[PDB]
Design a protein around this ligand. Structure first.
Ligand SMILES: CCCCCCCCCCCCCCCCCC(=O)OC[C@H](COP(=O)([O-])OCC(O)COP(=O)([O-])OC[C@@H](COC(=O)CCCCCCCCCCCCCCCCC)OC(=O)CCCCCCCCCCCCCCCCC)OC(=O)CCCCCCCCCCCCCCCCC
Ligand SMILES: CCCCCCCCCCCCCCCCCC(=O)OC[C@H](COP(=O)(O)OCCN)OC(=O)CCCCCCCCCCCCCCCCC
Ligand SMILES: CCCCCCCCCCCCCCCCCC(=O)OC[C@H](COP(=O)(O)OCCN)OC(=O)CCCCCCCCCCCCCCCCC
Ligand SMILES: CCCCCCCCCCCCCCCCCC(=O)OC[C@H](COP(=O)(O)OCCN)OC(=O)CCCCCCCCCCCCCCCCC
Ligand SMILES: CCCCCCCCCCCCCCCCCC(=O)OC[C@H](COP(=O)(O)OCCN)OC(=O)CCCCCCCCCCCCCCCCC
Ligand SMILES: C[C@H](CCC(=O)O)[C@H]1CC[C@H]2[C@@H]3[C@H](O)C[C@@H]4C[C@H](O)CC[C@]4(C)[C@H]3C[C@H](O)[C@]12C
Ligand SMILES: *C(=O)CCCCCCCCCCCCC
Lengths: 173, 63, 127, 43, 547, 459, 120, 156
């Protein structure tokens, strides 16, 4: 959480109306807001500075693992386990990553719904549009494989789709 | 007694929740998503100092 | 005011019970007899219940029989009893057959629609 | 006898209980509209 | 945002701390009930602060602080939703519970497990704020089944009694039958959409959603004791009266409606369900109210008053007025809690007697209790400009002036009349006439706790509806133009109900013998649904088991 | 795995060479330590399992079943030492040896990398299991129920041997990792249909499936507490673990060869849950609860979907802790009233306040109160079987309604009402009995805070 | 609705259909019709986040109301004057709907008489 | 440590067996009667009347109060089903059939009445409400690119 990369997790610019009090009565929320800032915001903010100063004193780093692409199951010889094992572990990693892609595109669709309030049905067409594409791509990739899903079964499903898609194209002509 | 209650059972809990929400929950995407404020005609925007155009003139009903 | 029409879950009241009205020497002896057995059992239990030195359970032989009779295995019954055992055969492999076609046909229909694209699964991602 | 005497004898009717306190209620009401009438009269 | 989000969660964490100090620490036993009462005292005030902010600018939050579980493309978080329904309901529930926690300190003073009782009252409240603030369906289930258990544990508070244990198991059995509908909705949304979160459900808005809504409606049928699954709510009066006030009349029973109020975005489009919810509400409000007239126990009558009202909430859902039903829930809580608390004073003064036949002549012996028993009863029927008026009146206006089922429109009005008849029967038998209770008089209600508790909710039954109705933001296009008779149909039937009631009471004075009418016996025995169904079904399931 | 096998072996020299009075303290304290080091098996990777050697591996499906297995041994020693206080020391030590022998076979059973090594260790477990249940079993009632073994061996263990041997001659290996990369479709054929039954009937009996379940209630009535704890907690799971592994090489035949079995399990849930209501013996009521719960696991395994496999793994672990907790609670009464009748002792909450709390938690998790892992498992199985066919929600719903009834009916009968007047030997609960329950329900509740570890390899 | 008896108990073709109305083109008897005018821009309603069902012709008053209230906090009795405006504006809006109903009713009877006499 | 003879045995087929059975169950011979002899498995257990414990007098001093049983008394086969908490068979104020008929009439009648209401709805006499901008086509989620069918609402 260095800071949610704004591109990945976007939020539209904030437009807040300025305080325009016409009435003469006092506004309690304004008073409580100041009391909260003094009583809560600052003594806490001081604590976080004391912790943060010591955190920067001892600074050590962790890195994000890099995995070289390796030949896919399409390049593996039949029953050659050492080739299939490399191909199979790689596919599992991507199957796992693609799941977190759908979640990200889901998190957007849920953030837009709340943010746009009562007008959400119009102001979230792009977010709904993106969510339907990722879902369709995911469905074709990984749906129906089963509990014992594998790269060989993912390939077989794809090869079945292409044949039916290929055949269909001919019938049009 | 109420002061002992308030400090232990209200003030201290709200520091923990504020430290937690401000420096752990808000530092992650979409954790707290708030409905965008209602913008009415003839309002002033804090960010841009913008002024929304006024509404058309009403049909001047008897009111 | 029609009399009370008794049912299995609607017992006939004692007050309107036809028999209770006329108790003769035969009936009087029986109830005295029943009280005799009841009286004797109460005595046997109360001696153990009130015994100062007892720290334990007054094993009720009647309870043991009830548990033993309920928890029975194969000592009764004859295998080729048509009136009862067959009625047991229906109530056992009967419902399993019914639910077979209830679930076979449904999964046949769903698969056929999926094999034709008719079924809509736009967001069906978790299975 | 005790149920029908000694202070239990007098019990108001359904309407009477419903209108319990009305006498004070009306007094406060009539004065109330006067205040708004008068206070508004002074603008 | 800072203040709204922080103080939205102090309330939830403030209530838990008394639970936490039971498991550890040893600073204060003996004084636990007052320690708990203060937590709700403070949790209410802290809960008002966000409510004022919502009124001022309509601010709404979702807080998903914790990531708990990621089942592939399904992510479950501890998400709280502080919106229109959460912000308004929480202060109302806390305010009502505040008084009850104080009325329990008196009603349950002698009982040696008083500390255990307050632990269970608080543990319910915690599982109710979870239910209302929940943002995803799974978290909704924790509250849904959390309250269901806490009913069992509290209904059967006196576990020596064999009826208490039967009544507790009955509460579980009906709710879990309803919770078949809840899982069906949970399965449908995951299968057809892809989340249990409410946000994504409303964003996609399935056009064909007959199945999930039947499942959701079935949960409300069991949780809120609608017809078909209603017998448990009367039989759940076996618990201590503070339990019946806090759970089975003020709050917990509304969760069945609260589930449908959550899902208005979907139910608004689906007419086919609107008919079912309207029909389902229409029968229950009539049937229970019809049963209420001939009952003889004060707790039982007020129990059927809850069911009859709850059906009126279900009709409001059907006629596509979800925001009114929410208003009815909030206004309904105040006076129905006060009724039970007042009936608690009578029962405690008359030495544990619940039969109104043996009550009477209390109109002067218990001033404070009698005043509230009148104020509460007037709100229920529809006394103008009382807390009950702001909700019930509009509901009748919107039912009369909307495309609806004719019979359902008629049953609602008939039941509203009946609401007048048994509003009096409590007053006439319990407050008016010569005394009929045993000789030795110990009627004494001069205690600060019982009085302060009753006093506070008495104010709520007067001004709470006026404040709430004014402040909450507009959300629908209210109908204010209609024929005069439809406009005042509510008041007329209420007035016509009173006239018939008072005449019936007077006929009871006249020295004429009693004559049994089939309509009368059907009323008293609850339509024979409890007797037939609690005998045929248990017999068949238990008997079929051995085969 | 040798880091666990060896120290488990060294428990036998520990038991035999200890001071006569310190066998329980040593065996419990050192069997507890072994379990602590078993948390190192959660070194799991997303893509690949944790493979230690040519013989043993540990993926996410065996890691919980291994940690549950080694957590149970110290519990089974605490549970059993009270009713073994009478009998002499040499007979006492052999009982502990049989339990240590059972753990050693079970840790090797769940981690065996080859299916014959699994099969042999899968049948070797019964040797200690039967000695414990027949030699130290409380019942000398004479059953003649060995026909259930004669049925089991002839119809279960023998066909599994001939099929496993047949498969190796064809595929060429029985290494589980190899079968992942070398598996071929199972074409329809009357010879293949017999291969499918051979590879599954052995595990269906142990679950047990409906119709093959009648052995379980009888075994629980005979067995000592230790026998029932291991039997319900683990040995039932060997069938579940066996079917999760072996369904890899049975596709696509499982699509149509699983219809008859699912109809037994789905309808089996209702039949056994209803029978629980009419039971008069605690151990039989708990024994029929296991058959009703395992009926979900059989359905979950056979519909083979990513959600069902997560459901089955959570249920297997959650059921193990719950049911063994119920068996212990039932034994605590039996160690007093000295009978297994439920009706005999009533209103026990008046005399044993804290014990009534343990009963309440055990019942709540059995009826599946959210957010316990008992419901995380059950919910997932319900979600997936809904996709398999929406009608199943009817059978799944009814089973939830009945399950709450015997769960609480058991609570009401034994813990509520008026105490039996004549029973005057309800001495206060011992610290041994309270510590034993707390070690079933503290881990069970804490798993809700981090449920991913028990959700299996499909997570 | 006394009118209901007319439709179900009385003759059907004469009474309007609550669902299928209207059944005549707008100008069949209304030469020169003035299109209803929406004061509030689409952007404004969307910016106000007005509930969709409240996004009708009377919005402009409703928008003014809410603006007053948000300013008049914590006073909640301040904005009575605006409240009436929107409420009345709906009342006039409702009336127009009533006129739409009757216009249908009159035409249906007029059609009935015309074709009947010709059919005679 | 209980005797085998004092435990249930096979169905009695001769009066001497019956005399032994009745004695075995602490019952007088006249009362004793076993179940019909089939494979149901009741053996020689007494077939007591099918009545719930709720019927028995609450004012007697039973050995087990809550159950309302007496020590050594024969126990009904389905006793667990007939405990107070469960199936209750107390005499009812009304005839069993009469309760069923009335309840069937009430429920069945109302459902048809709700059917009738659906067939002939109830509504106010007002025209369908009108909305601006092509019935809020854009605000209802319609496609921006595709153009709707223009709609016009005229004053009246
Ligand atoms: C969980 C809530 C339980 C609340 C409770 O205490 O009730 C127990 C209560 C037991 O007390 P009781 O029977 O009512 O009466 C008092 C007893 O006589 C006896 O109780 P007592 O008050 O007289 O004595 C103190 C108390 C407790 O005694 C103790 O001292 C507790 C010590 C054991 C707790 C250990 C937990 C920590 C585990 C160790 C590992 C973590 C620490 C390591 C970390 C190191 C730092 C990193 O005793 C007990 O409660 C016995 C059970 C305690 C263990 C229960 C398991 C927790 O029983 C119940 O109330 C049942 C719960 C009913 C359901 C309510 C919840 C339904 C809704 C679900 C909510 C889901 C929330 C989570 C999702 C968000
Ligand atoms: C429920 C509220 C408690 C949530 C919690 O237990 O902390 C978890 C959180 C970790 O963050 P998260 O990204 O959500 O990890 C999810 C992995 N399951 O933890 C955090 O991110 C922040 C935890 C630090 C909180 C600092 C405040 C401590 C207050 C003093 C202790 C009292
Ligand atoms: C299985 C593999 C072992 C096969 C040996 C079978 C025969 C063993 C046998 O029957 O010995 C019984 C013996 C009983 O003799 P006892 O009177 O109890 O003497 C005091 C015990 N310390 O009690 C004993 O068995 C004592 C020997 C126990 C074995 C473990 C001894 C620990 C040190 C050597 C490791 C041996 C591992 C085998
Ligand atoms: C008794 C004998 C039972 C029949 C066993 C049999 O005949 O197997 C036939 C089949 C031979 O085929 P195979 O030579 O291996 O390959 C060439 C393809 N024809 O054999 C095979 O190919 C596979 C053999 C699998 C192992 C057979 C195990 C024998 C038991 C089969 C029944 C199992 C079910 C038991 C009943 C369960 C309850 C219904
Ligand atoms: C739906 C899916 C169907 C399957 C799930 C439902 C299973 C129903 C069978 C339950 C099995 C029996 C459980 C034990 C019942 C019991 O012991 O309680 C009996 C109790 C009698 O006492 P009570 O009626 O409360 O009052 C008498 C005076 N004390 O009275 C009771 O507590 C019985 C309460 C249940 C009675 C059945 C009502 C169920 C509602 C569904 C039917 C209505 C149509 C929908
Ligand atoms: C914090 C203190 C521990 C030090 C001590 O033993 O005095 C403990 C002792 C008794 C406790 C108090 C009692 O539990 C109840 C007090 C009365 C009201 O309920 C407010 C909280 C209340 C004021 C508590 C606050 C705090 O927890 C106290 C004050
Ligand atoms: C609709 O729900 C109300 C029906 C009640 C009948 C009213 C008849 C009396 C009024 C006739 C003249 C007024 C014209 C509407």
């Amino acid at each position: 959480p260095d800071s949610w990369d704004k591109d990945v997790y976007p939020e539209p610019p904030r437009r807040t109306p300025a305080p325009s009090p016409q009435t003469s009565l006092p506004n309690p929320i304004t008073y409580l807001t100041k009391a909260f800032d003094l009583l809560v915001d600052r003594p806490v903010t001081l604590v976080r500075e004391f912790i943060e100063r010591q955190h920067a004193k001892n600074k050590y780093y962790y890195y994000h693992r890099e995995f070289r692409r390796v030949p896919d199951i399409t390049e593996c010889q039949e029953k050659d386990v050492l080739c299939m094992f490399e191909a199979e572990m790689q596919w599992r990693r991507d199957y796992k990553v693609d799941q977190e892609i759908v979640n990200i595109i889901q998190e957007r669709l849920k953030a837009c719904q709340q943010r746009e309030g009562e007008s959400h049905r119009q102001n979230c067409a792009k977010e709904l549009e993106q969510f339907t594409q990722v879902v369709k791509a995911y469905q074709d990739r990984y749906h129906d494989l089963g509990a014992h899903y594998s790269a060989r079964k993912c390939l077989a499903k794809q090869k079945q789709r292409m044949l039916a898609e290929r055949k269909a194209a001919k019938e049009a002509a | 007694r109420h002061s002992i209650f308030a400090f232990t059972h209200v003030l201290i809990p709200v520091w923990i929740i504020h430290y937690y929400l401000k420096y752990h929950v808000t530092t992650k995407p979409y954790t707290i998503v708030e409905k965008k404020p209602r913008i009415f005609p003839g309002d002033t925007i804090l960010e841009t100092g913008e002024v929304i155009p006024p509404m058309k003139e009403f049909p001047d009903q008897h009111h | 005011f029609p009399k009370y029409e008794a049912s299995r879950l609607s017992s006939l009241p004692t007050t309107l019970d036809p028999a209770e009205y006329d108790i003769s020497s035969e009936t009087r002896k029986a109830q005295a007899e029943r009280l005799a057995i009841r009286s004797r059992l109460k005595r046997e239990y109360q001696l153990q219940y009130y015994d100062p030195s007892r720290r334990g359970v007054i094993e009720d032989p009647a309870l043991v029989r009830w548990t033993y009779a309920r928890s029975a295995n194969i000592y009764p019954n004859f295998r080729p009893n048509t009136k009862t055992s067959l009625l047991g055969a229906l109530f056992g492999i009967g419902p399993l057959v019914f639910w077979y076609y209830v679930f076979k046909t449904d999964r046949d229909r769903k698969e056929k629609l999926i094999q034709e694209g008719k079924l809509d699964r736009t967001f069906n991602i978790s299975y | 006898a005790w149920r029908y005497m000694g202070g239990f004898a007098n019990n108001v009717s359904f309407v009477g209980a419903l209108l319990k306190g009305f006498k004070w209620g009306f007094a406060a009401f009539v004065v109330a509209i006067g205040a708004e009438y008068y206070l508004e009269s002074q603008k | 945002m800072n203040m709204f989000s922080s103080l939205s969660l102090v309330t939830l964490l403030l209530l838990t701390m008394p639970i936490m100090m039971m498991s550890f620490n040893t600073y204060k036993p003996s004084n636990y009930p007052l320690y708990v009462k203060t937590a709700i005292s403070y949790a209410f005030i802290t809960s008002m602060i966000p409510t004022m902010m919502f009124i001022h600018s309509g601010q709404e939050l979702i807080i998903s602080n914790w990531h708990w579980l990621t089942i592939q493309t399904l992510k479950l978080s501890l998400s709280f939703k502080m919106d229109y329904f959460s912000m308004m309901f929480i202060p109302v529930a806390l305010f009502v519970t505040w008084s009850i926690m104080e009325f329990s300190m008196w009603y349950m003073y002698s009982d040696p497990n008083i500390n255990k009782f307050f632990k269970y009252l608080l543990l319910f409240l915690i599982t109710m704020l979870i239910l209302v603030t929940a943002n995803n369906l799974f978290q909704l289930f924790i509250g849904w089944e959390g309250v269901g258990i806490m009913s069992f544990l509290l209904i059967g508070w006196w576990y020596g009694r064999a009826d208490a244990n039967t009544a507790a198991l009955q509460a579980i059995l009906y709710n879990r039958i309803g919770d078949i509908g809840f899982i069906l909705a949970m399965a449908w949304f995951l299968t057809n959409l892809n989340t249990w979160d409410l946000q994504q459900i409303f964003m996609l808005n399935p056009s064909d959603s007959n199945m999930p809504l039947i499942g959701l409606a079935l949960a409300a049928t069991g949780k809120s004791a609608q017809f078909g699954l209603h017998p448990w709510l009367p039989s759940a009066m076996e618990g201590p009266t503070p339990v019946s006030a806090l759970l089975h009349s003020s709050t917990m029973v509304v969760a069945g409606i609260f589930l449908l109020i959550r899902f208005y975005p979907l139910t608004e489009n689906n007419k086919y369900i609107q008919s079912i919810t309207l029909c389902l509400g229409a029968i229950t409000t009539l049937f229970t109210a019809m049963c209420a007239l001939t009952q003889n126990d004060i707790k039982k009558i007020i129990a059927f008053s809850t069911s009859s009202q709850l059906g009126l909430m279900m009709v409001t859902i059907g006629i596509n007025q979800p925001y009114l039903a929410f208003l009815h829930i909030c206004t309904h809580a105040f006076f129905k809690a006060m009724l039970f608390m007042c009936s608690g004073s009578i029962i405690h003064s008359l030495n544990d007697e619940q039969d109104i036949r043996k009550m009477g002549g209390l109109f002067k012996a218990m001033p404070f209790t009698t005043t509230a028993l009148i104020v509460g009863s007037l709100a229920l029927t529809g006394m103008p400009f009382l807390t009950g008026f702001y909700s019930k009146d509009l509901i009748i206006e919107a039912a009369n002036t909307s495309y609806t089922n004719a019979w359902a429109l008629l049953m609602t009005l008939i039941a509203t009349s009946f609401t007048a008849i048994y509003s009096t029967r409590i007053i006439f038998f319990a407050l008016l006439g010569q005394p009929r209770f045993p000789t030795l008089v110990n009627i004494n209600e001069n205690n600060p706790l019982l009085i302060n508790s009753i006093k506070r909710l008495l104010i709520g039954s007067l001004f709470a509806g006026y404040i709430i109705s004014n402040n909450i933001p507009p959300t629908t296009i209210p109908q204010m133009t209609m024929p005069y008779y439809l406009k005042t149909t509510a008041l007329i039937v209420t007035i016509l109900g009173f006239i018939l009631a008072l005449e019936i009471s007077n006929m009871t004075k006249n020295l004429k013998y009693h004559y049994p009418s089939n309509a009368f016996k059907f009323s008293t025995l609850l339509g024979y649904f409890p007797t037939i169904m609690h005998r045929l079904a248990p017999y068949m399931n238990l008997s079929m088991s051995q085969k | 795995m040798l880091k666990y096998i060896i120290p488990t072996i060294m428990l036998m020299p520990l038991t035999w060479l200890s001071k006569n009075n310190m066998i329980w303290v040593n065996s419990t304290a050192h069997s507890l330590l072994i379990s602590f080091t078993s948390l190192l098996l959660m070194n799991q990777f997303g893509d690949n399992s944790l493979n230690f050697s040519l013989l043993f591996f540990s993926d996410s499906l065996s890691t919980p079943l291994l940690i549950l297995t080694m957590w149970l041994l110290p519990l089974m020693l605490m549970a059993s030492q009270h009713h073994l206080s009478k009998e002499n020391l040499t007979r006492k030590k052999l009982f502990i040896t049989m339990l240590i022998s059972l753990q050693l076979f079970l840790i090797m059973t769940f981690t065996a990398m080859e299916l014959i090594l699994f099969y042999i260790l899968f049948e070797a477990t019964l040797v200690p299991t039967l000695i414990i249940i027949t030699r130290w079993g409380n019942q000398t009632e004479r059953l003649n129920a060995g026909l259930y073994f004669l049925f089991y061996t002839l119809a279960g263990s023998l066909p599994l041997l001939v099929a496993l041997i047949y498969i190796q001659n064809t595929v060429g290996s029985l290494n589980f990792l190899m079968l992942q990369y070398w598996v071929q479709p199972v074409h329809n054929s009357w010879s293949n249909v017999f291969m499918w039954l051979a590879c599954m009937m052995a595990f269906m009996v142990k679950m047990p499936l409906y119709g093959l379940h009648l052995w379980l209630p009888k075994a629980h009535v005979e067995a000592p507490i230790a026998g029932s704890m291991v039997l319900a907690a683990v040995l039932l799971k060997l069938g579940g673990y066996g079917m999760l592994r072996i369904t890899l090489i049975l596709n696509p035949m499982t699509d149509f060869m699983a219809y008859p079995f699912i109809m037994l399990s789905l309808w089996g849930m209702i039949m056994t849950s209803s029978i629980c209501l009419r039971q008069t013996d605690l151990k039989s009521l708990i024994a029929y609860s296991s058959v009703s719960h395992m009926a979900l696991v059989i359905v979950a395994i056979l519909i083979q979907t990513p959600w069902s496999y997560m459901g089955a793994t959570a249920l297997m672990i959650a059921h193990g802790l719950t049911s063994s907790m119920l068996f212990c609670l039932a034994n605590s009464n039996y160690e007093r009233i000295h009978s297994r009748t439920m009706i005999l002792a009533r209103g026990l909450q008046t005399l044993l306040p804290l014990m009534a709390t343990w009963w309440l938690l055990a019942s709540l998790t059995n009826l599946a109160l959210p957010p316990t892992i008992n419901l995380i498992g059950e919910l997932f199985v319900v979600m997936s079987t809904f996709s398999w066919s929406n009608i199943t929600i009817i059978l799944m719903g009814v089973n939830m309604v009945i399950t709450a009834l015997y769960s609480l009916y058991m609570l009401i009968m034994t813990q509520r009402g008026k105490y039996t007047y004549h029973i005057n030997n309800i001495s206060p609960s011992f610290t041994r009995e309270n510590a034993l329950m707390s070690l079933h329900i503290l881990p069970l509740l804490l798993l809700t805070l981090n449920p991913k570890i028990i959700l299996g390899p499909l997570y | 609705g006394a009118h209901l008896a007319r439709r179900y108990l009385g003759d059907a073709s004469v009474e309007p259909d609550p669902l299928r109305m209207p059944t005549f083109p707008p100008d069949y008897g209304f030469p020169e019709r003035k299109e209803r005018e929406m004061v509030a821009t689409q952007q404004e309603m969307n910016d106000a986040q007005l509930v969709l069902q409240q996004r009708d012709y009377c919005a402009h008053y409703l928008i003014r109301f809410l603006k007053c209230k948000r300013d008049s906090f914590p006073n909640f009795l301040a904005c009575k004057h605006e409240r009436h405006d929107w409420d009345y504006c709906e009342h006039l809006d409702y009336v127009k709907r009533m006129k739409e109903f009757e216009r249908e009713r009159r035409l249906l009877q007029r059609k009935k008489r015309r074709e009947q006499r010709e059919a005679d | 440590h209980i005797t085998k003879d004092m435990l249930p045995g096979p169905y009695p087929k001769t009066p001497e067996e019956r005399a032994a059975a009745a004695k075995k169950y602490n019952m007088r011979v006249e009362d004793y009667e076993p179940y019909p002899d089939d494979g149901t498995g009741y053996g020689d257990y007494p077939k007591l009347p099918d009545r719930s414990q709720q019927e028995r007098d609450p004012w007697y001093d039973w050995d087990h109060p809550d159950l309302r049983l007496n020590w050594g008394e024969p126990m009904h086969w389905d006793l667990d089903m007939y405990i107070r908490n469960r199936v209750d068979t107390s005499p009812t104020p009304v005839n069993w059939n009469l309760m069923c008929k009335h309840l069937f009439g009430f429920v069945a009648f109302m459902l048809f009445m709700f059917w009738v209401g659906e067939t002939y709805p109830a509504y106010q006499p007002v025209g369908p409400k009108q909305y601006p901008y092509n019935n809020l086509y854009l605000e209802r989620g319609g496609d921006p690119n595709k153009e709707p069918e223009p709609v016009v609402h005229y004053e009246i």
